[PDB]
Design a protein around this ligand. Sequence first.
Ligand SMILES: Nc1ncnc2c1ncn2[C@@H]1O[C@H](COP(=O)(O)OP(=O)(O)O)[C@@H](O)[C@H]1O
Ligand SMILES: [Cl-]
Ligand SMILES: [Mn+2]
Length: 451
Amino acid sequence: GSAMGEPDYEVDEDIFRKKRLTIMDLHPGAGKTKRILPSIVREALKRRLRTLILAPTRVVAAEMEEALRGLPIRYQTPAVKSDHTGREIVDLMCHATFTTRLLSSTRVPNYNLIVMDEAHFTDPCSVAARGYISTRVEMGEAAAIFMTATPPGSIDPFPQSNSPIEDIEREIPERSWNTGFDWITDYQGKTVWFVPSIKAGNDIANCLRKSGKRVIQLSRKTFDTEYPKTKLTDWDFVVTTDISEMGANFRAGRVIDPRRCLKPVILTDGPERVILAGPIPVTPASAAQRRGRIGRNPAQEDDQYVFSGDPLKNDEDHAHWTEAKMLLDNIYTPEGIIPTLFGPEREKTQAIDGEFRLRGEQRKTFVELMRRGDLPVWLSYKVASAGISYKDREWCFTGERNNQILEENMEVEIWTREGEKKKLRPKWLDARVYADPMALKDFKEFASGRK
RNA sequence: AGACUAA
Ligand SMILES: Nc1ncnc2c1ncn2[C@@H]1O[C@H](COP(=O)(O)OP(=O)(O)O)[C@@H](O)[C@H]1O
Ligand SMILES: [Cl-]
Ligand SMILES: [Mn+2]
């Protein structure tokens, strides 16, 4: 039994059995991260189990550290700055960090227990990690716990909450506004506003600030300084990207959710390429997670979820299913085995098994292009599998005529590290490296040989 | 677009 939001004294022993994968499918705010997780960790320490804890984002990592403070845990995330003895048997890191470690040099510990929080995260690295984890379990080398309110196949955007939620459909602005949206600033509580991009977030926050609103912006770029401010200071709005979609305890009263964002899609008509499609409706799982930021406090009964449009369950044309396979085909168990995707996530795309496996040197290039090059999984794979070395940038210029990149409707030209002026015309097109002006600037640095 | 930045 438990009280006062404190971890339970009692933990089922069966969750620690090798060959067992436990899905903890409990509604938002039930206590997965800050109550159940510490119980598991405490018991895993008593059992002397080599343990891995996985957060999707630094937001969830920060929530975990609050719940786990004082326990001998080695934090491998910049979100947390803690003293480590180097003798810890519990590691904590983000999903993508684990997959990166799996892909690289560099022996990963043989964990006996793996706890993944937000085990539905559709990031290609997270899907890949779930493949590796479920394979370790199946092989008898690990027990694993997958925690999420929205496990694969979830279709309900309005799940259970600790307190009643008032679900409201209204038009929501995507850009600044003058009139017509008084309900936004008339509201007297705290609002978490999900925006599809940092650029849109800047515009909306700037607009809210001219109404005399205290606004905190949250994203990968601002997390380090801004997240503690959501915890320690008084604010009216949090304008946030998907960084905050999961796990956050904002102690807020309202979520504004336009339920729409851009997604990478692989096109297979004509030469294969990646576009940024949409903005398109989010999945029911994403909508339920965003909504799940409120109705979290039983003593607070008038919380609101303001949304626009229906969700779209079908995400099968999304690049993340293929990119997860590209990653997982290149991960090995120490026994030598090919990891398979987590059951519920198999046959999301009709790609043949092991078809993305790279040979030795090409595998090393593949990792470099992602980590050093800041290139998407798909693009890194295309370049690596063509036998191109990390430093050879000729492919950025030898694409067909139609692959010419434009900026402000002019042909982008590169001045190379050796002095030549060349037109940016890559052999493979991935809109993620040219759509956003900042991304294009970076890809221009890459094409120059300055990355 | 968004997230991740570890041996
Ligand atoms: N800093 C905090 N102060 C007060 N209550 C909190 C705090 N953080 C979390 N809670 C509450 O504890 C409950 C369980 O939280 P959590 O473990 O984050 O839920 P889950 O992981 O299932 O979404 C929620 O009702 C939440 O609002
Ligand atoms: Cl909360
Ligand atoms: Mn949680």
